[PDB]
Amino acid sequence: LDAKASEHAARMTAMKNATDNANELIRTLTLSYNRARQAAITQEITEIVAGANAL
């Protein structure tokens, strides 16, 4: 019975740490994606501006 309680506690802490790590990765990846796509948006704006100027 004591071993079963220890097993349940170990699974508790392991899953909590796994969730924390996964949320950290989610935050980092979301930051990277948001930083990445704005560059493409600004490049599209620059292309529009250059096309308008060239005419």
Binding site: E44, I48, A52, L55
Partner: protein, 471 residues
């Protein structure tokens, strides 16, 4: 009376110069009809739509067909009015193009027939009617979770190969059979193969006798691909304006309409919008949708299929049309691959008619409880996926057991699905479907196998299938 002359040809863009003081109005139709004067020319029959006034007696136009063979200096005839299409009882059973010229090879429209202009203002504030009525369709999911409103606008969203065209065909069939009303189909950006299949299916089923159809294939220029929708709307408006009928208007794809508008704007040389669309996207959407309204004489209810590129619902074409929809239906390829047609998502579909005072207290409670059970079943799947279902509490096991049967019973067999499966379709009244779902929720069919609920009509047919399976 004076004529114009062709000045510039830039592909589907043509510039015409007129005499001072006789310039045509915007959106007027210009006719070009030229006979080859020698062996170095070809016969031309073409029409143009006025887009801009460039000044110095010059007009910027967009062509409704191929401009190949045009020669500078050709004579242009001004019709003095926008594109006018034949209208009335004559249009029933026929197939027209963007210009109202029949393409079914059954004969030309008499030249004395009444014709109405494509472009007209929307109905005013005083003449609108705001009564709400439920339009029964005979599809279980639609009738239960996303009820349709007479005189309203309904949008169907999904990716490629989900079943939007089949669902539209089934709606046409069911509503024509169980209501007898007039229907109009406008295939904005229609694929030729799909249009031919639709025409043959409707002619075989006999619904063609009460339907007018306008195609405007993709291979036509963007001007035609943009004006097909307005042509269909003009044909539909007559039956309520002059006869007080209740009319259904089906639009094949709004996404292609927006694409054609963006292409026309790019050809005219306007600066692109957010992701390359036209700056006038919202105004064009409003001009198209605002004419589909209910008045004192009659009403026009519209079912529109919306394509979503790469699942991105944030795209401007899906996004801007949301403000004009009363009910939304979402189709999922995940549900389609599982064999559950029509593959309508039961948790993403929304409707403004799902209120206790509109559909009834019993209907509202049944639909809400079905949604609650499905939502609860959604979370438990991962726990069920890893650990056995024995880990779930007693109530959770019953929730899963009933949610599987609810999900399978949401599916239905269509009449138009005969060509695919060979199993005849069925029509289910809303009272029957709410009774069946209430019985399933209360648990009087918990002992039947879950496979007996797949692709079935009324709840009695589920018992019949179970008995055929050996229960």
């Amino acid at each position: 009376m004076t004529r114009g002359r062709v000045i510039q040809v830039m592909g589907p863009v043509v510039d015409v110069k007129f005499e001072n003081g006789h310039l045509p109005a915007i959106y007027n139709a210009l006719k070009i009809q030229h006979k080859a004067r020698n062996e170095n020319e070809v016969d031309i029959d073409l029409t143009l739509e006025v887009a801009l006034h460039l000044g110095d007696d010059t007009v910027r136009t967009i062509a409704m067909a191929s401009t190949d063979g045009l020669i500078r200096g050709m004579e242009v005839i001004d019709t003095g009015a926008p594109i006018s299409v034949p209208v009335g009882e004559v249009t029933l059973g026929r197939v027209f193009n963007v210009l109202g010229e029949p393409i079914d090879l059954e004969g030309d429209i008499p030249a004395d027939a009444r014709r109405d202009p494509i472009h007209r203002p929307a109905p005013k504030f005083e003449e609108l009617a705001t009564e709400v009525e439920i339009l029964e369709t005979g599809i279980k999911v639609v009738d239960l979770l996303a009820p349709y409103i007479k005189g309203g606008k309904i949008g169907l969203f999904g990716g490629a190969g989900v079943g939007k065209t089949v669902l539209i065909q089934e709606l046409i069939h069911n509503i024509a059979q169980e209501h007898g009303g007039i229907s109009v189909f406008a295939g904005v950006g229609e694929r030729t193969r799909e249009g031919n299949d639709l025409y043959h299916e409707m002619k075989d089923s006999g619904v063609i006798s009460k339907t007018a159809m306008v195609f405007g294939q993709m291979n036509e220029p963007p001007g035609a691909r943009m004006r097909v929708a307005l042509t269909g709307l003009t044909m539909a408006e007559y039956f309520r304006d002059e006869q007080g009928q209740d009319v259904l208007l089906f639009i094949d794809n709004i996404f292609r309409f927006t694409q054609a508008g963006s292409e026309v704007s790019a050809l005219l040389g306007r600066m692109p919008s957010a992701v390359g669309y036209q700056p006038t996207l919202a105004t064009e959407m409003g001009q198209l949708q605002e004419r589909i309204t209910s008045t004192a004489k009659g009403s026009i209810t519209s079912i529109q299929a919306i394509y979503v590129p790469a699942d991105d619902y944030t795209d401007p074409a899906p996004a801007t049309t949301f403000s004009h929809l009363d009910a939304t239906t979402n189709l999922e390829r995940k549900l389609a691959e599982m064999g559950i047609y029509p593959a309508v998502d039961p948790l993403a579909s929304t409707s403004r008619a799902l209120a206790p005072e509109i559909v009834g207290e019993e209907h509202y409670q049944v639909a809400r409880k079905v949604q609650q059970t499905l939502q609860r079943y959604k979370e438990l799947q991962d726990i069920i996926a890893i650990l056995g279902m024995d880990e779930l509490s007693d109530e959770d096991k019953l929730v899963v057991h009933r949610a599987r049967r609810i999900q399978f019973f949401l599916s239905q067999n269509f009449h138009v699905a005969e060509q695919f499966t060979g199993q005849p379709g069925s029509y289910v009244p809303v009272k029957e479907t709410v009774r069946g779902f209430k019985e399933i929720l209360e648990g009087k069919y918990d002992h039947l196998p879950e496979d007996a609920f797949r692709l079935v009509g009324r709840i009695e047919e589920v018992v019949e299938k179970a008995k055929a399976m050996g229960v």
